[PDB]
Amino acid sequence: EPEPQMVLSPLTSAAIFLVVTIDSGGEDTVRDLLSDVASLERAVGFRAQPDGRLSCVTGIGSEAWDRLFSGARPAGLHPFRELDGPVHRAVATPGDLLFHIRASRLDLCFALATEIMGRLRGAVTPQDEVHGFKYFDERDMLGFVDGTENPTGAAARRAVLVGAEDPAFAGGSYAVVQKYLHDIDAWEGLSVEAQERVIGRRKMTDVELSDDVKPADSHVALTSVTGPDGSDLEILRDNMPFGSVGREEFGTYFIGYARTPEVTETMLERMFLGTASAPHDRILDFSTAVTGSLFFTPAADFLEDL
Ligand code: HEM
Ligand SMILES: [Mg+2]
Ligand SMILES: [Mg+2]
Ligand SMILES: [Mg+2]
């Protein structure tokens, strides 16, 4: 019965991440926009189907939820949890609404962002806006393939969609965003083999390092999580490169979706606070988080019915 938003998108070479705060008294304008956001997605995207692949996933933050709605809330919806590691910090930054806009073309993303922001004029203040672009063969700004071990099909739906554990919000998901900037000069001072040690995969061929070679403080080791029952705890990432050459800004826009924030926050805790065998994730020695926000992306029928 409950239809998910397009959390599980086919691959898209362009994206706009829009994060805004809701102004005092902007709630009615926001509720009106939420009830139309699927209609606007069809209005912009339909004429470019099937290759356009335009979608918007709309998220609401914990504080914004309690300003917009009354009664029961999604069981896991809280402000992003700031992590204060001995070396690396995951900052919490303002954000009430997320529009995760993806397509095969930036123009479609741009036109939908314009229609959305057009309707929210006078009710919201811009916080963050990133225009993301596919970078060669699905690489990120560190020169590694990014997305390889994402779950797909049924395994992806089981990892990202709320079900019987929170029935009133079935078909929703939890999105965590962090905008990362990379120290490309420091990164380029490492050999390819030193970089592979940091990530935990081979750079050109994208083959995972063997169990006896993969460092405990590699990115892949610390973001590989097995639950008590033995099965892998997974998230769905759609990381997007961005930047500005004049400002020497070379970034990764991280977005991770999970059926509970506990899986994503377990990964972040291992990365920023480490484990018995790792001080922290070596990727953070080349990567600074400058935002951090958590959102609930409800079933599409929750937004339509407002
Ligand atoms: C800081 C910028 C980031 C970059 C540049 C980055 C890059 C990558 C790369 C290159 C891989 C290996 C290929 C793949 O399977 O996708 C990877 C894997 C992964 N990343 Fe990250 N990542 C970043 C942040 C994060 C964060 C913040 C999390 C979680 C909160 C995360 C979770 C994962 C997971 C779950 C995998 C799959 C590991 C596995 O099961 O094999 N990443 N990432
Ligand atoms: Mg990609
Ligand atoms: Mg530099
Ligand atoms: Mg694995």
Author numbering: 7 to 312
Quote the study on this structure:
Dye‐decolorising peroxidases (DyPs) are the most recent member of the peroxidase family to be discovered. These structures reveal a water‐free distal heme site that, together with the presence of an asparagine, imply the use of the distal arginine as a catalytic base.
The heme redox state in the crystals was corroborated through analysis of larger DtpB crystals suitable to obtain electronic absorbance spectra at 100 K. Identical electronic absorbance bands to those for FeIII‐DtpB and compound I in solution were observed in the crystals. The heme‐Fe in DtpB is penta‐coordinate and sits out of the porphyrin plane towards the proximal His225 ligand.
